[PDB]
Amino acid sequence: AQNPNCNIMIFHPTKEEFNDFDKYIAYMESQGAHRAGLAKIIPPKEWKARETYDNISEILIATPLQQVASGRAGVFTQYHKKKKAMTVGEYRHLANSKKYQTPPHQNFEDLERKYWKNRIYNSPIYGADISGSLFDENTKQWNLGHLGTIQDLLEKECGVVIEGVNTPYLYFGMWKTTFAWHTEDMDLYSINYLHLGEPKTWYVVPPEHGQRLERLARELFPGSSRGCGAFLRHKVALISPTVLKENGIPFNRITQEAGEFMVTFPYGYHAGFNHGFNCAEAINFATPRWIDYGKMASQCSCGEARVTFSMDAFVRILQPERYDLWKRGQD
Ligand SMILES: O=C(O)CNC(=O)C(=O)O
Ligand SMILES: [Mg+2]
Ligand code: NI
Ligand SMILES: [Zn+2]
């Protein structure tokens, strides 16, 4: 068995190997990359996502989200308070302000310490979940707006044609902006490209150990767990590496820098934070190996998770027994 300790693997594809996306994902899996839940892909030196980032300031962040924490430093939830619209240039200026900017630090480990010590005492503003792309249309390799769609994969594997679309999303971050512990919708893969700016630190639980994280989460967030049998689908709970280690939960960590891709694998729980002003692009995708994860994915039916249009068909076809209850939670 390849990668039996479930370490995060880092890949350096050549420009030739960068042509065929599906083939390279399958290659990484042949080397055991999925066992970690997360892999890093450093593009060949010949590649670029676009020519420059000099002309992005007029992108609108219609609903910036202020991420307000509750709990203790290592075990907290966050809620998202909607703020007034602002442009990316306005948001960049805000991120760099004295109130929001990254503090002085020695290295990534010192900043990580500061994040976990101090996160809860601040409410950073995240420009998350903005439909759009920053890849140039002429970038032919690993262009996250040009991937094979999940609807097409389901149709190719299972024979059933379904409605729905699959487009990317932009994330504008600042120091302390946080992504809570989650797996993807329908335990899909994700791919995330950090276009510019400061790093993003990731934590990940191997897919084979995901239920250990779920059991801890039920213990640590006991009201939430009574409310919903899949409350991590709400994407609000944070648990620090120190607390994970104290509770024996297997995990790994890695820092993504500008110009690097990360792939999350089916049922790989992940969480993390941004170091400072940045912009990432991410999308979900599927492969043949996903189908069995999709069929077994938990679902939130309490009403909280509310998701895209395109998840309806995935539930309907892969999980027909669950469909009626899940759709009620959508309505
Ligand atoms: O970058 C973020 O805020 C969150 N991203 C992801 O969870 C991902 O790419 O799967
Ligand atoms: Mg612009
Ligand atoms: Ni994710
Ligand atoms: Zn729920």
Structure description:
By secondary structure, the protein is an alpha+beta fold. It has one domain: Cupin (Jelly Rolls), CATH 2.60.120. It contains ten helices and 16 strands. It has helices spanning 21-30, 88-95, 108-118, 150-158, 210-220, 222-227, 241-246, 290-296, 311-318, 320-330, and strands at 9-11, 38-41, 60-61, 65-72, 75-82, 86-87, 125-131, 169-173, 178-182, 189-197, 200-205, 237-239, 252-256, 261-264, 269-274, 278-285. A ten-stranded mixed β-sheet has the order 1-2-14-10-16-8-7-4-5-12. α9 runs antiparallel to α10. The longest helix has 11 residues, at 108-118. The chain binds N-oxalylglycine (OGA), magnesium ion, nickel (II) ion and zinc ion (ZN). The site of nickel (II) ion has 5 residues, from loops. The PDB classes it as oxidoreductase. Keywords: PanDDA, SGC - Diamond I04-1 fragment screening, Jmj domain, epigenetics, oxidoreductase. It forms a monomeric assembly. The entry is titled "PanDDA analysis group deposition -- Crystal Structure of JMJD2D after initial refinement with no ligand modelled (structure 97)".
